[model samples]
Target: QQKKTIAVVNATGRQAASLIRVAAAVGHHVRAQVHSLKGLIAEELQAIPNVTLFQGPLLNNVPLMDTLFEGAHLAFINTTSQAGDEIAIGKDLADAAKRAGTIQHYIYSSMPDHSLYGPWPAVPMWAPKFTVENYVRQLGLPSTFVYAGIYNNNFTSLPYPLFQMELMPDGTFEWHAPFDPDIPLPWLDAEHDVGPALLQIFKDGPQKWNGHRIALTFETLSPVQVCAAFSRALNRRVTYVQVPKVEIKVNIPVGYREQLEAIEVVFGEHKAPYFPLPEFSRVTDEARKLWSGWRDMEEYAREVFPIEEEANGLDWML
Candidate 1:
């Protein structure tokens, strides 16, 4: 296989960091951008021989963006909502990749925009990704758009506003959400699974994936099924409660509150699949064919879940 110069933004992000780890280890020249080197993820990327870190926020950093994609055969762009304008940053990053004139394959990390599916409430976080997808298409850059599933990493015992698997007094776990318990949601172990799927896409090249959207999900499990898997993995009873909007007890930002409310409308009232389109629904088999190491919920529960809980200060002994 040819050694490619791959450009990546949001280098410390779960998806991009995963890709960088695999890409750099395989001897690819990874020009990666990070906000800072203070975190472990950032420091790890800095230590990699083949990875180059461009520090500071990518928003409004024309020089940094231009330099990030210089002499790159391919690029992976994942802009964050924290950037303040995800849509603009994504467009700018794509523009930089095109301006560099060396990017042959431009891969975008995106999420579902529910508003496109009729009169559904627009998710604040996802709307930008859909906007960026349209802009990338308008630019006519050689590209493949990937829509990520609900990350398995999102599940935590902490009092997070969404997807909180709370450990009850009886030593069992209960996941409270607004979604219909029977409605299946696409799931991805993003930190562990995104890289292999992306590597496969890079290997296949623009010929197969240009102007295509791949659902990068490994499993489509219902809330009940998720609980069942967690039960097996944790060796304890786990339950799913179809609640109204997850009550924001903790001080979650207003943006997240909007997202949570929109999500309830999309899944609770409309019963819409997270990805909406039939093509985007249940691509686990196809995704597995591309990267056989695709992780399912049970695997994530047994491996990542325990560690994450422990890290978040959850005392199992109690």
Candidate 2:
């Protein structure tokens, strides 16, 4: 069981950095290759030992791929973008990897299972990652689909006024949906979830996780539960409020509309039913066995808030 050379494509982004750190920690000889888009971070990655950095113009440097795919047994393909030409880029990367010869395991980080929800008008962002996942399956490539849940990190993105019960320009918090404040939503600590699971998929082999889609989460808490956790962590009374569905089109900030629309589809209109508690228990048990000592959402907030004090207002405010 000698370690394999693992290459993480688009390795300098937030999620990819987590994967890279965990891969290196787990003793994989990791090479981080980035597309030309990453400017400053490319230099930063070069400083890490046992990690080789490669940068190439879009799908142009055939030799860069030649060197990257060489002797590499496992690779994690995490594309960097919330929006853009992802499907085209993903197809090219998969084709190049296939041509490279030694790749035994390919783990793709994908969006939520769209098959269950079907086509909802609100979720256009689903197309890119979903398209790539389908492409990988159709090609019959040995791949593992790592479907990550919403990161607990998203809590930081919520309107600060929402936490303080103050109104924004629209005079409302605009929670915007009829979700049960107590119904658990799948959420993970991106730093903890993506990398470790990917490392397991790579180091252990596809036999351990082939033809499977795995969802990782530290905890699943409802909006009310999330507010409660914040109340506890910050020692302030927090509330869970829902904005009317009609208000979404007008109330959401223009820049955040696209991302919010995708969320609205899953947590909003489509509103597909998830498995019951018993099934979730089975899933949680299996997850615990695979990666033991999972962190509770509240505990994660308590731990990381201190480190992010200046930006997150977790210090004197807490």
Candidate 3:
């Protein structure tokens, strides 16, 4: 068994943080990158054995990016527009990996490009990733693109922009979204499951997964069906309300607001599946083979939902 060196960016994110732990536990070396050493996850990453901390802003840090991939056999790049020019950052990461000449497998966390589906307008947050993916392909890196599903971890009683499963006045919950209540979207416990899935990809190597766009989802369910799962778990009525217009109840980034508005138009008018199959296939069955502990929505609702709710300061649980 080869103990490979893995370069991972956005080490503070749920997906990268989870992967860092899993890879390190198995004796693989992780070159973990973070913008700052402030948060709990950053502190935790610093303490993990076999994990090297690459601390700096990803933007305009060509040397930092180059150093991150030095001697690294694998790389995982999950770029955010919040860092500035997501497409540029993504391209920079890919170009650095290519320069290193050691990275055998590069995995990019990507999102669906609605333009590929038809004349549909670009979803602000998603288009940049597709642009990056195209760049990676153009560079001809041995890469696998993983399009993560709507995070199972996004559900909250707190006022999150899109996935708030709000606790109602009468001991019930309501979820409002622009998506069609009956149309199913792919879902994943990104924090819990992404690491294991990516680990398996590394173990299997590029020969098996390179150039494939995997819909990294475990369950496919509609908004109505999702609410029903919550209803069962909490033994209360959980309703899904289809909102024709998006409402921002809390302070979020201006870019995120644009993202939400565009998502509304994409799913509402275009009615596109978040991750369309044939082009991007759901690998629930394949993922189970990699890690049997892959979580479904029901399991998340029953085991994790209440705990997360309480953590968010909801005192509804008896």
Instruction: Give the number of the best model, judged by TM-score.
Output: 1
Alpha-carbon runs more than 4 Å astray in model 1: none
lDDT of 2 by residue, 198-307 (tens): 67666567787777776666567777787677667655555677643423323544435665555555555556433222234334444455566566667655776445
Q: Write the per-residue lDDT of candidate 1 for residues 1-318, one digit (tens) a residue.
A: 678999998898889999999988898999998888789888888999999898878778888999888889999888888858788788889888889998999999877777777789778898779889989987757899988888998998888877888889888899999889998888988888899889889999898988888888888999999999999987899999998777566897778888888888888778887888657644776678778977789988888888878887888734
Q: Given candidate 3, what's the lDDT at residue 225?
A: 94
Q: Please give, for residues 228-258, the per-residue lDDT of candidate 3 as tens digits.
A: 9888877889999999767679899989988
- Ordered from best to worst TM-score, the candidate numbers read 1, 3, 2
lDDT of 3 at 274: 80
- Which wins on TM-score, candidate 2 or candidate 3? 3
RMSD of each: 1.4, 4.7, 1.5
User: Which regions of candidate 3 deviate over 4 angstroms?
Assistant: 281-283
What candidate 2 gets wrong by more than 4 Å, as runs, is 35-44, 56-66, 81-83, 113-119, 157-179, 245-256, 273-281, 309-318
Candidate 2 is scored at a TM of: 0.79
